[PDB]
Design an enzyme around this catalytic site. Structure first.
Site, PDB file in Angstrom:
ATOM      1  N   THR A 145       0.865  -1.217   0.000  1.00 17.61           N
ATOM      2  CA  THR A 145       0.000   0.000   0.000  1.00 17.61           C
ATOM      3  C   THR A 145       0.855   1.203   0.000  1.00 17.61           C
ATOM      4  O   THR A 145       2.099   1.083   0.007  1.00 17.61           O
ATOM      5  CB  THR A 145      -1.133   0.005   1.109  1.00 17.61           C
ATOM      6  OG1 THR A 145      -0.609  -0.255   2.404  1.00 17.61           O
ATOM      7  CG2 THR A 145      -2.070  -1.115   0.607  1.00 17.61           C
ATOM      8  N   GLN A 146       0.265   2.423   0.069  1.00 15.05           N
ATOM      9  CA  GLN A 146       0.968   3.654   0.082  1.00 15.05           C
ATOM     10  C   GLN A 146       1.658   4.048  -1.166  1.00 15.05           C
ATOM     11  O   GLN A 146       2.747   4.578  -1.072  1.00 15.05           O
ATOM     12  CB  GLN A 146       1.790   3.790   1.383  1.00 15.05           C
ATOM     13  CG  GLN A 146       1.134   3.331   2.742  1.00 15.05           C
ATOM     14  CD  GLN A 146      -0.197   4.085   2.945  1.00 15.05           C
ATOM     15  OE1 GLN A 146      -1.268   3.484   2.932  1.00 15.05           O
ATOM     16  NE2 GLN A 146      -0.084   5.450   3.122  1.00 15.05           N
ATOM     17  N   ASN A 147       1.050   3.666  -2.286  1.00 16.94           N
ATOM     18  CA  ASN A 147       1.717   3.649  -3.524  1.00 16.94           C
ATOM     19  C   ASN A 147       0.794   4.262  -4.540  1.00 16.94           C
ATOM     20  O   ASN A 147       0.011   3.545  -5.137  1.00 16.94           O
ATOM     21  CB  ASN A 147       1.966   2.186  -4.018  1.00 16.94           C
ATOM     22  CG  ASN A 147       3.028   1.542  -3.114  1.00 16.94           C
ATOM     23  OD1 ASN A 147       3.938   2.181  -2.576  1.00 16.94           O
ATOM     24  ND2 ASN A 147       2.903   0.140  -3.046  1.00 16.94           N
ATOM     25  N   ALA A 149       5.328   0.304   0.531  1.00 18.06           N
ATOM     26  CA  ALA A 149       4.634  -0.756   1.184  1.00 18.06           C
ATOM     27  C   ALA A 149       5.405  -1.307   2.367  1.00 18.06           C
ATOM     28  O   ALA A 149       4.856  -1.924   3.272  1.00 18.06           O
ATOM     29  CB  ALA A 149       4.234  -1.976   0.299  1.00 18.06           C
TER      30      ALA A 149
END
Lengths: 216, 246, 201, 213, 196, 245, 249, 233, 238
Positions: free
Chosen positions: A1-3, A143
């Site tokens: 995530t965080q992408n 991530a």
């Protein structure tokens, strides 16, 4: 995530620096979206003979970072003095190019881990696509930041003198959580160790999870 | 600006061949005298070369660079006619003048024009394709202080303030003939300045007031170019007067 | 006219007074924000609209006024500063910029003031107000006003106008900066506190 | 804090307090915010010569660009002229660089900290937008108005009917560095981990870390 | 009925003009008198009306270019053509949705043909005409002008008619202004009349 | 060889009446005065040897160099006027680096040899630049195409080579490469063979003592151009002295 | 080399003026002549073509006089080669000014703008100045009917009757002698035009093939620029016979 | 043309050596550095009594705190001053401090030699400059006089004179002046050499003197204040 | 003549005559000695002045606080290369943030100074630079010529009869690395006098000292701030 804005991703890149060596662990499973397109892929690049690169985040954005990296080593060889880079200069020069690239609509949170010893200077660098670059003890972004980095940092704060063995068992454990939580892979890893004299990395080998989450 | 030789090469004289050659090119733009009064600053030029099949506007050495700065040209020589090479310095000078009006909207300064021109000539040296200049201009105009200005510039790149200066057919010679004629009365009286310009032109040219066209410029009003016919009336009286100072 | 960033011309001086904070952010931008900065002595340019817009315009202005003054050796007029300020600023304008800056100087007929904005206004004035909302500042300023107007009236007017602003519109801080701008040399007059003058006058 | 277009998280809150002889610029040490904290070391503060030190805070990416840029300026004034770059010369210089970060938009506030030739010690706020001014109390970084208030009481001491100042002592500033960050931790846990205190007397830079437990 | 308010009526031996003085920032007139009437010459007058700021920028660029025609010929340029010429430049700018559109009023005297007056819209339309007004003010006068006078009407009646028109703006229009400038033009020149 | 100092070289765009510019002929003459630089292609790499001039015991590797890495896998050994050789290395370094960005593989030398030879001819064409005053060799080991050795003269001819030498005696060294079969050799044996030829060919009239510096792009350097490994260097050094005797 | 030659193109010579500018005037002398004459209600151009040949097909009926615009006309005096480039620049300038102006292009305005390009080359660029003097005829309201003359020297002139090309000194006097200030009307002027062309040529005998005659006459609401067909010129060649008597008498 | 790459076998340009001879015909300039100011003297070149000293100057402002007096060829001086003026004003916005007398002299010095017969651009030339400039102004390091010459070298000097004879005007200045002294004695010392080297003798419209003190702005002297400096030659 | 001013005429040795003139230009210029250690780099340069009422022009120029240069030759030609060296080093510092190696920087300078040697009608520059730098490996003194050709030396001296200075340097070559900042200057002083006649030794006001490192920031010693570094010299070693 965080992408933001990713397609083909490298999920997670471990980087923990010990005294004169770094161990980075990155999966061979290289998802092109949810589907694992390549079950084995070496995400380890040779900057130089004296430097090594290991990268996490979108894999397409990594090949871009690779072409830029590649030329910088060429420049140094280019003089005729035949110098090998310093970890800080190559990683740092690219951190600036990540400040420029934000403005156009392609996004980068591209994250590379540089360990080198070259010329006479020992660097551990991490370089980002938003351009958070720093020297570190241990780092990982994207991530890596959402799930393994904080447990790795929690151990790192009272014991700042963790060794490659204590980290090894921990890398194996954390990637077990990646096969289960992340949708970009199901296990299998490459173990890369960068040194300040040679770039070393045994090929991607399977690993398999252990079940105990249907007891209660 | 493209060539394949240097435009000038230096000498141990400390002259520029191209600036001196240019000085003759600007005496092609014939003789011009300008005197500064209290409220009317006046310049007049030699030859309109009238044949009554021509227009008077096209031969002018009087050029309007702005509507509150004007100039008349020459320097030294005796060489052949041609408005054109001088005209080219005007075309640069008129942009230079106009760009300043954009910057400072009040009646633009004489000083600005002269300084820009000196530097402009040195610059042309540096470029291999660019032809240098070397001219003198009789810059006339007004400040925002409303006071009269008559300035003059030289091929040597140097500009000076003056109460009367003449250029053409020997720059020092027409200038000296004015130095005699000058008295302290002349510059405050409006009437007296006009007669100075006409006596200087009347020397080198036959039958002026057809070859004497002069313009008066004023503090409040822009450039007025007088008809030649009213100038001839002056020439007849003034030529009587010209013999007297001699 | 706007905020309290204010100047008006008299017969002798341009009396310029300004507040600390009136910029961005819910609190104070800086606690001791000055808008009568002196990078040169000639005449302030007021703090119009955004902080970035006048200030950016001003490094250019401080450099540009000098360049005219130095080369002619005769000073710039309120008009030469208006035209000069208008040509540099129009081009820069298009980054969502707009200011209300002030070309001032003593010329031929007393003080001359030309009102320049960042969209290229060129209007002639004798009062300008920069920022957001002079409507609380303006009435008390007006009674004894005229285009040329004496120093005695100017003291009475200037003291009430600033003071009244404080009472009515409250968000400033620190002290009320008063400077008087002649045609070649401004001086910082007095620094009386905004809370101190407001009860008094 | 600030919107993604150069960020996805950076945090970091800085406080700096002017006495009249020393200025301590305190900042949290750790590189934080994304959703967790990335790294425990990073140098925000840089002394360009010995007499000017800048500390830039908020995003660690902006801080790495702007600080090196502040080093570059010191080299530009030495080469061009022959001089050492004083406090004024640097403060003014930062604004030129800051011009770039107005259509770009940032909330990284760099603060030049030094002694000035006006008879006193100086702490300068330029805003990341533009403008530069000198001040007796200041909060700069991801919120430019959350550190600011504590200093407003303690340093300025303008609490009469009128405004009269009265700067505090050096010993009072050290305690102010240690305390502020712990107070700010409660409010926003974007001041966490370790407190780094830098002390600038405008002729030297010294550092102190302290852990926060 | 377009933007800001201007009106000019040529009787072809007189021209009557009035324009607002008002470059307004917020709700106050920062100065009372403000220039909207510009003199390129003493025998050419341009009255630009629209945006306060836009009017000025457009005029100055054309004005140095106008001067350039004067510089070369050292006689008058064709003034009717020069006010059209700027308009053709504004036709190229019109495809762009940016507003730089100016409602202009040309008063000029040309030598050989005689006087010319040309009307310019913010839609950009050149007309020689008996009287035209820009913005709301076109709206106010055009309908009375057929009825109450002629296009050869007397200066006195014109002026009374104008005074009343400017009072109707204060009275009826949401845009009043308590300073308007009035200028009267005979057959060749500008006279400055009493402000109202 | 034809050239006269008056006529047909008083601009760098003047073509000579013989069909070959005087300036290119002058550029070759400078290569002929300089020291010998050799580069021999092996089956498992290329081995370079260029003699590095020592005029003082103050000098380090940086002084009087003639080994450049155009890429970081491709080498360049030059001989002749050093000033133009180092400038052409800098433009070439850029040209290689741009190629790597786009193409993304160890560059095939056959493409380099055409593009560089044409660039060297371009400078003979143009007035603002004059011909290059060195002859140089480009040498690489890659897996894309193997060992490759090319030499470009200052004329702007590219020809392919098994083993070439350029110096004070270009013909004697090339006959000596002919005698030996590199077909029998691997990259290890070649290092010995380059080393002797440099000592014999070169005639001191301008040296005073030289240091031989050699570079590998071979087996024990993995397709990147590194300076010779220590074991290889010592094997090479003994044989060179032994061959004299 | 290039550093051992002279041609003094951008470099001033001992004269104080460039060789290249002065030489261009000599080339103009031995090339076909162009004259423009003033009439009370029009202006006209008459020119001698650069073709001395006895057989022309008339592929292009502008080989000397080209009509640029519906408001303007030009002639060429000099080399046809430098004319070709200049003709193309003129079709654009003449129409551009008109798009904006909406008024027949002023004869003066056009020449000064053009003359600026002629001088630009000689001063800089290392190019020689065009070997062509262009004779412009046009009408604008604020000067009236006009004729302007263009040079390679960047000299312009306001004229009422002038001729440039071959034997110019004779030609301008001959136009002055027959035609004073404002004397002669458009029709009688066309005759006068041919009469001077018959006398002055590079090679004798004036024929339809050797001449092209152009009229600017203001028609009903439009200013009409026409190049006359060979047929019409012929009626003027007999008119030119009549004109010789008439000048003398 | 004839060689403009011309080196002598010693190892300097002929063309630069030629550049000095031009300076010698031109105007005369004296710059003296004092603790208490910088005074600048320059030849006005009278030749009519109608040329007004207040209206026209050859002491010109680089900044409002810095002056430059010119010598040698006049056209050449103007080109160096216009680039230097902007550099200076741009410096003031950015740093907010006055520009060192040395800082401005270094910039102009780059232009002096860069010539070549062909491949010329504005940054290059077809022949080297024959002007020497005396840049005098007061900065934060104190009053400084820096001297720039035709060879495009910058040197600190507390007294330099350049004119009709460059070395001659400097030798008169070497006899009189002393390093640390009062403003009136420095102003006197500038006038005194000036009349002796020149053909022209000392008047109050013959020469132009303006003085820059530290803590003052550049002041160009009034008609009366110019005449006060004439009493002590 | 004019075949020696052409940059397109060459000798039968293959040397352009214009490059040959350009090397000599250095040699008529004043002598400078540049040495390195393993902590510092020292630039000692010989000054000149126009008059006794003047201070001497720094021949040590300020680039950065980690790299510094010293000139010998023409100042105006110097200033163009100086504007180039400042632009590249500062670039390096912003983008890379490495305290730039000397070795990379000189090679690019070599490219530029080579361009006029190839151009027709343009003269080569003729100033000699001894560039002192400090990177993380340690100090290097590289010498770049008016041609591309650049040297990596422990110590070098260039100028009049510079070969003689090298001899002193060669005898103390090893020592330089052990010695201190203070001594490196004193060994420089002793080399610098060999170039000049033996009738003359150095003085306090003709010596300029430029010290480089990152254990210290860049310093220029002028004419009276020279004295502390100066003490300890031997009069004409032969």
């Amino acid at each position: 995530t965080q992408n933001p804005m990713v397609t083909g991703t490298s999920v997670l890149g471990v980087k923990f620096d010990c005294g004169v060596v770094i161990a980075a662990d990155m999966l061979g499973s290289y998802g092109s979206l949810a589907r694992f397109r390549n079950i084995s892929r070496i995400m380890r690049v040779n900057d130089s003979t004296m430097l090594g690169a290991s990268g996490d985040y979108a894999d397409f954005q990594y090949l871009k970072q690779v072409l830029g990296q590649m030329v910088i080593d060429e420049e140094l060889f280019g003089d005729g003095h035949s110098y090998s880079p310093r970890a800080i200069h190559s990683w740092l020069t690219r951190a600036m190019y990540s400040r420029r690239s934000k403005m156009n609509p392609l996004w980068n949170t591209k994250v590379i881990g540089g360990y080198a010893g070259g010329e006479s200077f020992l660097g551990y660098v991490d370089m980002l696509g938003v351009a958070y670059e720093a020297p570190s003890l241990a780092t990982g972004y994207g991530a890596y930041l959402a799930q393994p980095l904080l447990r790795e940092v929690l151990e790192k704060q009272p014991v700042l003198s963790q060794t490659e063995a204590r980290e090894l068992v921990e890398r194996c454990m954390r990637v077990l959580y990646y096969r289960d939580a992340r949708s970009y892979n199901r296990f299998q890893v490459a173990t890369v160790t960068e040194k300040g004299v040679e770039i070393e990395g045994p090929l991607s080998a399977q690993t398999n999870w252990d079940i105990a989450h249907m007891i209660s | 600006m493209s060539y394949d030789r240097a435009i000038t090469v230096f000498s141990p004289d400390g002259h520029l061949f191209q600036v001196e050659y240019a000085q003759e090119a600007v005496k092609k733009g014939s003789t011009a005298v300008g005197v500064r009064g209290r409220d009317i600053v006046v310049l007049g030029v030699e030859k309109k070369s009238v044949a009554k099949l021509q227009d008077e506007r096209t031969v002018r050495k009087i050029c309007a660079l702005d509507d509150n700065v004007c100039m008349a040209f020459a320097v030294v020589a005796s060489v052949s006619g041609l408005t054109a090479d001088a005209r080219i310095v005007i075309n640069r000078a008129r942009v230079e003048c106009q760009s300043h009006r954009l910057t400072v909207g009040d009646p633009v300064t004489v000083e600005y024009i002269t300084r820009y021109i000196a530097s402009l000539k040195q610059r042309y040296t540096q470029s291999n394709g660019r032809r240098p200049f070397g001219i003198s201009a009789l810059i006339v105009g007004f400040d925002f202080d409303g006071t009269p200005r008559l300035y003059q510039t030289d091929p040597s790149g140097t500009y000076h303030a003056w109460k009367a200066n003449a250029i053409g057919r020997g720059a020092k010679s027409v200038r000296e003939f004015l130095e005699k004629n000058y008295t302290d009365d002349a510059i405050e009286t409006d009437d007296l300045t006009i007669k100075l310009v006409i006596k200087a032109l009347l020397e080198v040219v036959q039958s002026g007031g057809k070859n004497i066209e002069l313009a008066v410029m004023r503090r409040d009003q822009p450039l007025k170019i007088l008809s030649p016919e009213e100038i001839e009336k002056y020439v007849a009286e003034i030529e009587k007067e010209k013999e007297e100072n001699e | 006219t706007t905020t309290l960033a204010f100047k008006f011309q008299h017969g002798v001086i341009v009396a310029a007074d300004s507040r600390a904070t009136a910029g961005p952010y819910i609190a104070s931008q800086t606690v001791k924000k000055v808008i009568e900065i002196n990078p040169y002595l000639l005449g302030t340019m007021a703090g119009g609209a955004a902080d970035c817009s006048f200030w950016e315009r001003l490094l250019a202005r401080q450099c540009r006024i000098y360049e005219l003054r130095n080369k002619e050796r005769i000073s710039v007029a309120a008009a030469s500063k208006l035209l000069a300020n208008m040509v540099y600023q129009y081009k820069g304008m298009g980054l969502s910029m707009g200011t209300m800056i002030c070309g001032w100087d003593k010329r031929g007929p007393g003080l001359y003031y030309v009102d320049s904005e960042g969209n290229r206004i060129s209007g002639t004035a004798f009062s300008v107000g920069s920022g957001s909302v002079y409507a609380f500042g303006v009435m008390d300023r007006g009674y004894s006003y005229d285009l040329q107007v004496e120093e005695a009236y100017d003291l009475a007017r200037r003291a009430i106008y600033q003071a009244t602003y404080r009472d009515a519109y409250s968000g400033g801080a620190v002290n009320l900066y008063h400077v008087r701008e002649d045609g070649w040399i401004r001086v910082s007059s007095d620094n009386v506190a905004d809370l101190h003058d407001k009860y008094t006058s | 804090r600030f919107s993604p277009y150069a960020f996805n998280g950076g945090t970091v809150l800085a406080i700096a307090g002017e006495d009249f002889s020393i200025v301590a610029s305190d900042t949290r040490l750790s590189e934080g915010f994304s959703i967790h904290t990335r790294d425990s070391p990073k140098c925000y503060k840089l002394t360009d010569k010995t007499v000017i030190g800048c500390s830039g805070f908020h995003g660690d990416c902006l801080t790495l660009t702007k600080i090196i840029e502040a080093r570059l300026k010191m080299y530009k004034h030495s080469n061009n002229k022959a001089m050492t770059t004083g406090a004024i010369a640097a403060m003014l210089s930062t604004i030129l660089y800051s011009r770039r970060f107005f259509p770009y938009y940032v909330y990284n506030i760099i603060e030049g900290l030094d002694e000035e030739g006006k008879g006193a010690v100086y702490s300068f706020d330029p805003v990341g937008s533009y403008q530069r001014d000198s001040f007796k109390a200041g909060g700069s970084a991801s919120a430019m108005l959350q550190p600011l208030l504590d200093n407003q009481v303690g340093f300025k001491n303008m609490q009469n009917v009128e405004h009269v100042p009265l700067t505090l002592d050096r010993a009072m500033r050290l305690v102010k560095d240690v305390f502020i960050s712990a107070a700010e931790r409660d409010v926003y846990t974007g001041d966490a981990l370790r407190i780094c205190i830098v002390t600038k007397e405008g002729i030297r830079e010294e550092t102190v870390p302290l852990r926060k437990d | 009925m377009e933007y800001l308010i201007g009106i000019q009526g040529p009787d072809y031996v007189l021209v009557a003009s009035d324009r607002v003085a008002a470059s307004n920032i917020v709700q106050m007139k920062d100065d009372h008198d403000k220039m909207f009437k510009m003199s390129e010459k003493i025998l050419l007058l341009c009255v630009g009306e629209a945006g306060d700021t836009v009017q000025f920028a457009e005029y100055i660029q054309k004005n140095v270019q106008l001067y350039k025609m004067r510089n070369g010929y050292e006689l008058s340029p064709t003034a009717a053509a020069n006010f059209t010429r700027r308009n053709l430049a504004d036709c190229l700018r019109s495809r762009t949705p940016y507003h730089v559109n100016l409602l202009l009023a040309g008063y000029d005297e040309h030598e050989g043909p005689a006087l010319y007056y040309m009307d310019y819209l913010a839609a950009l339309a050149k007309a020689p005409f008996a009287a035209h007004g820009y913005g709301a003010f076109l709206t106010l006068s055009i309908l009375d002008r057929y009825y109450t006078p002629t296009i050869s009407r007397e200066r006195a009646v014109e002026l009374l008619r104008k005074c009343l028109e400017e009072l109707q703006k204060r009275f009826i229009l949401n845009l009043p202004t308590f300073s308007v400038r009035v200028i009267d033009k005979d057959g060749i020149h500008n006279l400055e009349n009493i402000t109202f | 060889m034809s050239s006269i100092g008056t006529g047909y070289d008083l601009s760098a765009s003047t073509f000579s009446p013989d069909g070959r510019v005087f300036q290119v002929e002058y550029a070759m003459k400078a290569v002929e005065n300089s020291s010998t630089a050799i580069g021999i292609r092996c089956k498992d790499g290329v081995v370079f040897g260029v003699e590095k001039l020592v005029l003082s015991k103050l000098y380090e590797e940086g002084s009087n160099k003639r080994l450049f890495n155009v890429d970081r896998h491709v080498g360049m050994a030059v001989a002749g006027l050093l000033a133009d050789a180092r400038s052409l290395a800098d433009i070439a370094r850029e040209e290689a680096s741009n190629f790597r960005s786009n193409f993304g593989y160890n560059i095939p030398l056959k493409h380099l040899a055409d593009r560089v030879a044409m660039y060297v001819h371009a400078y003979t064409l143009y007035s603002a630049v004059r011909p290059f005053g060195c002859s140089f060799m480009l040498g690489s080991y890659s897996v894309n195409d193997g060992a490759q050795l090319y030499m470009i003269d200052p004329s702007g001819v590219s020809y392919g080579y098994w083993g070439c030498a350029i110096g004070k005696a270009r013909q004697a060294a090339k006959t000596e490469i002919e005698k030996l079969q590199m077909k029998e050799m691997t990259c290890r044996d070649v290092v010995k063979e380059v080393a002797k030829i440099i000592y014999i060919v070169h005639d001191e009239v301008k040296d005073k003592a030289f240091e031989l510096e050699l570079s590998w792009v071979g087996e024990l350097t993995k397709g990147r151009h590194e300076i010779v490994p220590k074991d290889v260097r010592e094997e090479a050094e003994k044989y060179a002295k032994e061959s004299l005797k | 080399m290039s550093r051992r030659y002279d041609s003094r193109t951008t470099i001033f010579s001992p004269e104080g003026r460039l060789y290249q500018v002065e030489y261009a005037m000599e080339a103009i002398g031995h090339a076909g002549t162009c004259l423009g004459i003033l009439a009370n209600d029009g202006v006209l151009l008459a020119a001698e073509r650069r073709n001395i040949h006895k057989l022309l097909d008339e592929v292009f009926f502008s080989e000397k006089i080209y009509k640029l615009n519906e408001d303007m006309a030009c002639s060429v005096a000099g080399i046809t080669s430098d004319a070709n480039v200049l003709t193309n620049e003129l079709r654009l300038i003449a129409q551009r000014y008109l798009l904006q102006y909406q008024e027949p292009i002023p004869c003066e305005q056009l020449v000064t703008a053009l003359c600026d390009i002629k001088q630009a080359y000689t001063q800089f660029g290392g190019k020689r100045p065009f070997g062509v003097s262009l004779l412009y005829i046009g009408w604008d309201k604020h000067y009236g009917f006009q004729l302007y003359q263009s040079d390679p020297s960047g000299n312009y002139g306001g004229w009422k009757a002038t001729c440039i090309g071959n034997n110019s000194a004779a030609a301008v006097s001959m136009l002055k002698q027959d035609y004073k200030e404002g004397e002669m009307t458009l029709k009688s002027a066309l005759a006068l035009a041919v009469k001077v062309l018959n006398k002055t040529m590079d090679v004798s005998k004036l024929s339809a093939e050797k001449v092209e005659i152009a009229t600017l006459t203001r028609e009903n609401g439009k200013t009409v620029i026409r190049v006359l067909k060979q047929k019409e010129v012929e009626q003027l060649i007999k008119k030119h016979e009549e004109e010789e008597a008439k000048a003398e008498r | 043309d004839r060689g403009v790459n011309t080196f002598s076998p010693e190892g300097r340009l002929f063309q630069v050596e030629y550049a000095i001879e031009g300076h010698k015909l031109g105007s005369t300039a004296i710059g003296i550095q004092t603790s208490e100011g910088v005074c600048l003297a320059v030849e006005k070149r009278i030749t009519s009594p109608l040329m007004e000293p207040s209206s026209i100057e050859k002491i010109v402002e680089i900044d409002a705190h810095i002056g430059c007096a010119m010598s040698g060829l006049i056209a050449d001086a103007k080109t160096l001053i216009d680039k230097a003026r902007v550099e200076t004003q741009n410096h003031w916005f950015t740093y907010n401090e006055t520009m060192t007398v040395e800082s401005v002299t270094q910039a102009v010095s780059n232009l002096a030699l860069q010539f070549g017969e062909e491949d010329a651009d504005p940054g290059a030339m077809s022949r080297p400059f024959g002007v020497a400039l005396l840049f005098g102004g007061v900065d934060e390091k104190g009053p400084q006089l820096f001297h720039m010459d035709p060879s495009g070298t910058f040197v600190q000097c507390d007294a330099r004179a350049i004119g009709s004879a460059s070395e001659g005007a400097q030798s008169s200045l070497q006899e009189v002046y002393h390093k640390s002294t009062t403003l009136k004695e420095a102003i006197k010392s500038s006038l005194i050499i000036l009349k002796q080297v020149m053909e022209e003798k000392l008047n109050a419209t013959n020469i132009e003197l303006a003085t820059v003190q530290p803590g003052q702005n550049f002041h160009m002297f009034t008609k009366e204040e110019l005449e006060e400096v004439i009493k002590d030659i | 003549n004019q075949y020696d001013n052409d940059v397109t005429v060459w000798s039968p040795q293959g040397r352009i005559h214009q490059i040959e003139y350009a090397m000599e230009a250095v040699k008529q210029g004043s002598a400078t000695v540049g040495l390195k250690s393993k902590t510092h780099a020292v630039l000692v340069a010989l000054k000149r002045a126009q008059s006794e009422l003047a201070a001497h022009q720094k021949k040590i120029l300020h680039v950065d606080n980690h790299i510094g240069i010293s000139i010998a030759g023409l100042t105006a030609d110097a200033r163009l290369l100086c504007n180039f060296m400042r632009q590249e080093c500062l670039d390096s510092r912003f983008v890379f943030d490495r305290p730039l190696p000397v070795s990379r920087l000189v090679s690019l300078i070599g490219s530029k100074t080579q361009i006029p040697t190839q151009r027709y009608g343009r003269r080569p520059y003729g100033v000699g630079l001894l560039i002192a730098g400090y990177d993380d490996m340690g100090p290097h003194v590289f010498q770049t010529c008016p041609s591309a050709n650049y040297f990596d030396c422990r110590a070098m001296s260039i100028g009049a009869r510079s070969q003689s200075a090298r001899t002193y340097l060669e005898r103390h070559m090893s020592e330089f690395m052990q010695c201190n900042l203070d001594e490196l200057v004193k060994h420089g002083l002793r080399a610098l006098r060999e170039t000049l006649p033996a009738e003359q030794d150095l003085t306090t006001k003709n010596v300029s000292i430029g010290i480089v490192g990152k254990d210290l920031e860049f310093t220029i010693y002028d004419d009276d701030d020279v004295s502390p570094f100066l003490d300890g010299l031997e009069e004409r070693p032969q």
